[PDB]
Amino acid sequence: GQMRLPSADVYRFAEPDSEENIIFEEGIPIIKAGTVIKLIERLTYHMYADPNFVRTFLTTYRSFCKPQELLSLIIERFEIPEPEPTEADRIAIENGDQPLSAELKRFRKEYIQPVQLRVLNVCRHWVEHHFYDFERDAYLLQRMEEFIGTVRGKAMKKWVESITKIIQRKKIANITFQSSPPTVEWHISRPGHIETFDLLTLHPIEIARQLTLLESDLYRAVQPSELVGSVWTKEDKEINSPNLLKMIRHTTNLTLWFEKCIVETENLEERVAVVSRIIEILQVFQELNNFNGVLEVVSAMNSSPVYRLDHTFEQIPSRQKKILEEAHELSEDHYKKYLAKLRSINPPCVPFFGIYLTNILKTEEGNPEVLKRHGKELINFSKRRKVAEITGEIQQYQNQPYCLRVESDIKRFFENLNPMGNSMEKEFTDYLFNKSLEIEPRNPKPLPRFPKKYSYPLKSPGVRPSNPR
Amino acid sequence: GMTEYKLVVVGAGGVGKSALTIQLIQNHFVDEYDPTIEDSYRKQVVIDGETCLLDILDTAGQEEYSAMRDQYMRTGEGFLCVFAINNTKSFEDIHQYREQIKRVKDSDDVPMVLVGNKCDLAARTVESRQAQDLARSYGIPYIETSAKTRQGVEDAFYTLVREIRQH
Amino acid sequence: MTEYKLVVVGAGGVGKSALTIQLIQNHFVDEYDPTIEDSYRKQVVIDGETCLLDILDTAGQEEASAMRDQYMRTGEGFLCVFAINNTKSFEDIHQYREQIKRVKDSDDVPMVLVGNKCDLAARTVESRQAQDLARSYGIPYIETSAKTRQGVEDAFYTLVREIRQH
Ligand SMILES: Nc1nc2c(ncn2[C@@H]2O[C@H](COP(=O)(O)OP(=O)(O)NP(=O)(O)O)[C@@H](O)[C@H]2O)c(=O)[nH]1
Ligand SMILES: Cc1nc([N+](=O)[O-])cn1Cc1ccc(F)cc1
Ligand SMILES: [Mg+2]
Ligand code: NA
């Protein structure tokens, strides 16, 4: 038969499952809703491990339980009472013999040790992957150190000593490939001559590579703490979502730089060379699976200042028109083709983050925090699972590094790009649109001619890589 | 077959804008939502006896991607310009959203509606008369909606479709 | 995208976690932090087909030895890892093989035998002895180094191919 459990009066996690405290979805069960006590019981269940549940819970629990209260509850979970001797044990002891303690030994082996180990696994995952709770609350960290540091008994000893060391390392806190990265490519600008760096003087292959390294690093830096609770949309967004906002602001700045390069090139022939070069950069972004970069270019080409430049579009070579149109089609029909392409490529890649943000926000806004059942309020855990499915997808694409060499000067050039200067957004985007009207006036105004502005050759070196010995 | 209307929701972030489309598209009577499922933003409706399909673009959460606004807006035939009735800044933003729509669509007469959204019980700071006056100065309808009771939600979208039909 | 459930098993300290983290992050973990249970996901194209690997990294320490049935039920294929400088870990392989067969009630479970730490000169398990064992199981034998990446993709992606053909 099943093991007997402690009395629910001395140990709260032995209360029987009922529809008043846990609801399952329709081969381990999937929880739709439950009390916090039942969620923690299943987080640390004696019959099975649920590593996905541990990640989901630790990512999302702050919407229904404070960090200090979570720690209290898992310590309470850990402290399991042992059963009293059975009748057979009593009779053995009364005869001066050693009891078999069969039921006690089974309860230790099949209930206490698995539950206690799974509590420690929650602690380990909490410290390793969600350490911000402890960075923001020093007293929470003291309580965790004290709890782990006072666990006795040899069954847990290896993990207790390990978790103690992991905590200490996290308080004071390398990539291998088998292939070499390709050689850095140079065009008109030569190494070390940062003062000449520009859209047409750097090699378009190397522009796309260095922007991909930059955008990959920005993508990889975003933690779930910047996302759960929709905090990047709220008044404290600069405090709670700084890496996300840095990533978005880079994307916005690059798009505006592309627009500025285009509309400040008043000579039509030169402006065609500028647009063609940006489409070549887009082609390398596609080859690198840098979808953020792809959409940075597409957004610039569909901006109001650029979209209306019919005379420029007419002279773009047909093969480059097709590259741009295929990239644009990724976003059509609510990103249908983008989503399919992301799920088909071989990483590394740089996803477009905006879709994730909209889906997290709408999941949080469109589902209730609690479900009311039999007069009780149960935590709606299905809602939290949906959010954690999105953060898990984000994290899956954060693992794979690009096998590309950093060029520190080109990296710095793009880090310091500031197309808006000191201007405010409206002032700057009105400036870009007025430049568009200047260089290609609205019909029936005649098309003017403008002098050339570039003194170096406009011919592209192309986007096929070279390989000397 | 039936006409499809491509509608675009625009407005300040962080003040409950997404509740408008969620409440429309939702199973009205089950408070639940999965935005990831294909066609969680398409709804067949009957407006003035004529069946049509609404395709709604709501990029709520992407407000910081400001250089993508033009591309998103150009997909639309009609626009809901949404502010929160307890956030004066979101109301003051409306003028620039409307100007941007007109530029993107290259038209001085783009179908649009002004929507004042009640997203919580915090004190209202934009009175309905202020919003009615702004809407009249633009020549567009004004609809107020609740983010919690679904009041006004159908009216906002149906009024916009009527603006498209009567353009 | 087909999903594949891989499970990495073997004695404590043989490098199950280091192998998994090398595959997932291209990073070699120098620390020896004993695992309780960890899970990872990886999208990867194998033989032209995109799939999603769910990788369960399990506990090798003997104190966790009563908690294995639950993860063996869910796994579709198993990497059976020993370290080529630890004879005891090689002798432990047959216990994992027999438990997997019992739990899944099957003589035909996708598996790969992995001899890890092949960057180390001081080998105590000869390749021939491991290869003989693998042949008796009907499975391939792949020597790996989580430190250098030698053999790491080969081991995991060979297991995927065996699940695919199962
Ligand atoms: N030289 C070398 N050391 C390795 C290799 N793989 C793992 N190690 C080292 O061996 C130790 C144990 O590695 P680890 O991955 O934690 O082993 P494990 O099998 O996951 N242990 P457990 O079963 O307790 O979770 C670590 O110090 C790690 O750096 C390898 O291929 N080469
Ligand atoms: C016509 C067009 N198709 C797309 N598109 O995304 O497919 C964008 N554009 C606008 C445009 C692009 C380049 C240019 F030089 C002038 C205008
Ligand atoms: Mg391990
Ligand atoms: Na206000």
Is residue A341 domain-shared with residue A385, that is, in the same domain? Answer: no
Task: Please indicate whether residue A275, judged by its CB atom, sits closer than 6 Å to ligand 2.
Answer: yes
A344 belongs to a structural domain? yes
Please write down the HEC assignment for all residues of A70-134: HHHHHHHHHCCCCCCCCHHHHHHHHCCCCCCCHHHHHHHHHHHHHHHHHHHHHHHHHHHHCCHHH
C-beta A304 within 6 A of ligand 2: no
Could you tell me whether strands C141-143 and C111-116 are parallel, antiparallel, or unpaired per DSSP bridges?
A: parallel
Q: Which residues contact B71 (CB under 8 A, 6 or more apart)?
A: A298, A299, A302, A303, A331
What experiment produced this structure?
A: X-ray
Integer-rounded Cα Rg, in Å, for chain B is 15
**A389 in a structural domain:** yes
Asked if B27 has any chain A CB less than 8 Å from its own CB, the reply is no
* Structural domains in chain A (count): 2
Measure CB to CB from residue B67 to each of A233, A303, A357 and give the nearest one. A303
Token pair listed for A465: 């890589």
Same domain, A360 and A401: no
Q: How far apart are CA B8 and CA B76, in angstroms?
A: 5
- Answer whether residue A177 is part of any domain: no
Asked whether B112 and B140 are in contact (CB, 8 A), the reply is: yes
Residue A231: inside a domain, yes or no?
yes
Torsion of CA A102, A103, A105, A108, to 10 degrees: 170
Backbone angles phi, psi at B50, to 5 degrees: -115, 120
Measured between CA atoms, how close is C111 to chain A, in angstroms? 21
For residues B45 and B25, give the distance between their C-alpha atoms in angstroms, rounded to a whole number: 10
Closest CA relative to residue C43, chosen from A397, A286, A283, A376 = A397
Q: What is the 3-state secondary structure (H, E, C) of C89-136?
A: HHHCHHHHHHHHHHHCCCCCCCEEEEEECCCCCCCCCCHHHHHHHHHH
- The total of other beta-carbon atoms located within 10 Å of residue B86's CB is 20
Phi, psi angles (nearest 5°) of residue A11 = -145, 105
Does A257 share its domain with A246?
yes
3+ Cβ–Cβ pairs closer than 8 Å linking A and C: yes
Q: Are residues A335 and A360 in the same domain?
A: no
Cβ–Cβ < 8 Å for A360, A392: no
* Judgement on whether residues A283 and A418 belong to the same structural domain of the protein: yes
Q: DSSP of B62-117, one letter per residue?
A: -TT-GGGHHHHHHT-SEEEEEEETT-HHHHHTHHHHHHHHHHHHT-S---EEEEEE
Domains of chain C: 1-166 (3.40.50.300)
Full residue range of the structural domain in which residue A332 is found: 182-353+397-466
Do A232 and A125 lie in one domain? The reply is no
Give the residues across from A372 on adjacent strands: A377
Give the strand order in the sheet containing A31-34. Answer: A22-24, A31-34, A376-380, A370-373
Residue to substitute from A46, A107, A124, A127, interface C, most C β-carbons within 10 A: A124
| Dihedral class, residue A356 (left if φ above 0, else alpha if ψ from -120 to 50, else beta) | alpha
CB atoms within 10 A of CB A169: 13
Find chain B residues with C-beta within 8 A of A362's C-beta. 18, 22, 33, 35, 58, 60-61
Distances (CA, A) of A76 to A13, A72, A117, C95: 9, 6, 14, 35
Assess C149–A contact: CB distance below 8 Å, yes or no: yes
Q: What are phi and psi of C44, to 5 degrees?
A: -155, 145
Question: For chain B, first and last CA: distance in Å?
Answer: 21
| 3-class secondary-structure state, position C39 | strand
Find chain C residues with C-beta within 8 A of A175's C-beta.
25-27
Q: Is A67 inside a domain boundary?
A: yes
Secondary structure of residue A308 in the 3-state scheme: coil
Residues A40 and A96 in one domain: yes
CB contact under 8 A, B35 and A230: no
**Rounded CA separation B83/B90 (Å):** 5
CA A406 to chain centre: 22
Q: What is the DSSP letter of A188?
A: S
- A232 and A339, same domain (yes or no): yes
Distance CA C16, CA C29 (A): 11
For A274, counting Cβ atoms within 10 Å of its Cβ (0-12 exposed, 13-18 middle, 19+ buried), the class is buried
Q: How far apart are the first and last CA of chain A?
A: 73
Do A137 and A281 reside in the same domain of the chain?
Answer: no
Same domain, A36 and A110: yes
